[PDB]
Amino acid sequence: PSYTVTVATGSQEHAGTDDYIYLSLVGSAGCSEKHLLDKGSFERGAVDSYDVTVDEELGEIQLVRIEKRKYGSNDDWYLKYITLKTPHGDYIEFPCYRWITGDVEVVLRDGRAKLARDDQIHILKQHRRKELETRQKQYRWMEWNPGFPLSIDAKCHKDLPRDIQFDSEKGVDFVLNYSKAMENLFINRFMHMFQSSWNDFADFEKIFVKISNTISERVMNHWQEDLMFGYQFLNGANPVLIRRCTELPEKLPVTTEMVECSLERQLSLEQEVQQGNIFIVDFELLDGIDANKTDPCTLQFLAAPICLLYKNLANKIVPIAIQLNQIPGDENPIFLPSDAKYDWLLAKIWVRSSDFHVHQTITHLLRTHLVSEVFGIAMYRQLPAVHPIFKLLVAHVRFTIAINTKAREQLICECGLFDKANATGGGGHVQMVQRAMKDLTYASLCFPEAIKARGMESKEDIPYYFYRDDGLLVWEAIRTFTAEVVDIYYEGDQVVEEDPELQDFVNDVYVYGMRGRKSSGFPKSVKSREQLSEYLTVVIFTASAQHAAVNFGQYDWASWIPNAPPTMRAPPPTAKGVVTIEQIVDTLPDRGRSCWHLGAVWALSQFQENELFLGMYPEEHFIEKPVKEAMARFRKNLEAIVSVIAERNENLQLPYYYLAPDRIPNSVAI
Template structure:
């Protein structure tokens, strides 16, 4: 594996290859790697995840208990139930395996997020034991690998492809169909559409077509599409609005969560800019209500993007200026910052296949004490599959030579002095944030760079 793309390495990909087995690094990735939107604070264990006090007591602070740590807000959960029951693909006549289970985490007194219990399937049974850090090294490693593989599939299919790429396509088509080019919201949004339709059109074939990385994943193309279908039916507006997302998951105060810290600052900067532009062109709610092109735009997005699902909370029409501001903030954030957060670190974290791969060959362990390093090697993808996945994350992590960064408006579509000044102020705020992030990162063992505005593309372009 170290010989694959030996000429394309990063400091972080080397770090991952060195530290992937460590529990504290495993936990860290659920906060600051490429899928930071899946854990939540846990105050009550799911009934089908019967972790006992005795199981996890050795991994908690001395004298503490699971119940008391839950009360303190130090226990977190990742639940992959939406993957449960999706038929995986067959490989050489045998059915592969995808584990839609649970992982329980503990934020220890050293502010390190540690995995303390993993159940690989939703329904507990003798053949679905709860794995613990005190199990044999290879048992615990296999449990972490199977859970992480499910997370990688979830990340690539849902959090990356669907939530940024494919929904961006909805926003783009609605914009070009509903707004004339002289509409101020067209001028505001259009710079964020660069290359997206092209990359989506080619990406669907390259990723989901025969021999593509998602086609040869454990779920296969049909399973990945079913996963996206399930995820779309569960989507909520608040999930896409970062301040609400963080609050709903109870992660406002969890330490060392740089995605949250940088993301909320970016959300606020984008929101202030959008608010200034929208309020300039829509001085009152009345202007919003009578703009038929704006109403057609949001109706088309609600109908074709979110399939008219009123329970999702996505708006079907706009009644107030603040509603327009919030929705456009969400659109721009999703197509810039959120895409960068879930895309730009893929080579760093997933080039090293044992740390997270779309495919595992052997079935997950059903009893403890039966595994060895030979089991792990037989479970990992073969050379050809590893190369395919490595090529995918390399390509997706590349930057264009003509990259346009967040906040740049090279085409200067706005003519009025006021919007031009708002753009300058927006760019200045992004520059200040970039400097602050660089300063913070200089003091970290693992720098978090993915939401540095100077590294964020202005559109979903890769």
């Protein structure tokens, strides 16, 4: 006449509670009494089980109610799951993975994923509708800054619902992690020297040689070469800007007689464009952006350079022309590799600095962080936990809302940590998000479509694009995985369309997240399994693979300041033959900003000791068999990719491992 109720406490630091825990089973034939549990503490990592006897036949168990009542001071409890062993020998499981504060009573369905059309009885429908009601009351949309994608309604981290907070209050913390990173890097004494320029490169080299890793040391030695400059646009930390030219821009008055020395095929520059040997990186987005004026004693400067690139006979991409500003003229020279050494070097440094600003604000912040947060909030608002898509996506939006809220509390807010080192600080980066937001499309988030639209899709013409190669693989694995999860729970396209909560989810992304602008190209609705599989792939790939590629290479390529400076303390050169090495040094970031730069890119490039990489789903929201085997196959494909990439890296001078599935986190956690 008894049930065996098993309760599992989380492994997180504060997962334990000393408060009262009541439990009541809700069955079809009736509900059970409230049973007090333990009368003691539920320690972290611990699993408790009780023999509970019921006074009347409950029939098939539908819901489990858990109730936390206070004892002493409040103590947050993290319930992982609950399993029942019924008198009829049935084993039922209830996935939770939620923080339980004394304010509310938590009610859980069984693990089996359910669409709304599957629930016909009052008890299940009541729960489902009330769950969404509480969701939409806790998770609300907000416009943090004009023209931004909508984000969560919270000023700071602690205001967030306990469920979507970090497991610790200061577990991740920009203020704390940065100063801690600057101590690990032995540069803590330099944190306040914004008026002190490095004496020469050797002065910074003395500091850098201690904290350099493999790639960065390679960067220290080879940053001045043309081959490395062009290399980063394909395999660097921000390889999303380069595109193949179909014609020379009229704002770039470059001639064959200027670049004839770099041309190696006896063709004119115009004819080289016809062969598709010419590539281009345009920073028009940076034009008009306000420079950092938050420091009255330091003048910081920006540029909007146009860089002309060329694929030589060795199939390597190298710079042949660099114009630092958008509108051509006598004071906006076109710098060439045939100019004096420091002229062509300083021109390069500026393009590198420009690449860095677009990287952090557009590629990094907007196109991965903010986009994922949108998918995350829309998921919480419109998708109940029993829904299959919730179970699939929840592992990929982990800590996303939390890390963004932290960043808006400390990093990119007015007078935030971002303002110290960056030339886009002081509001400039806000202008960039706004302007880029206008051209952020749904197709641009679809990886194969994104690569083609830049004209980089050909493996044959452009064989050394590793970001593309590995990316296309990881994308194909996730597309295959989601197509299978969708095929399990959706009989056909008609079921996908008739799903009210899925459409509500898709609609919340279009209308609120993307501000309901028609030019974004996001689906207003999803009416087929094929489309749903692509949509889910966009969500997962962005939060995992795409974010990994553009985040964890920050210390590799940017720890050597002259290769990716956060700010320039002198305006772009308007004339040739003038620039000296002493002036490049005084233009480059000071000691204070170099150190807040070094600390930042180091801290953002770290993996957690408990980091969950792609395919790792420790928390079991899905408990059904067909989806387990789906998840299984997905892990096999990923492990097949890690091998493919591993072999390829053996034949490279500088391996590309950012998109290797064992280094790709599940979500945006940093």
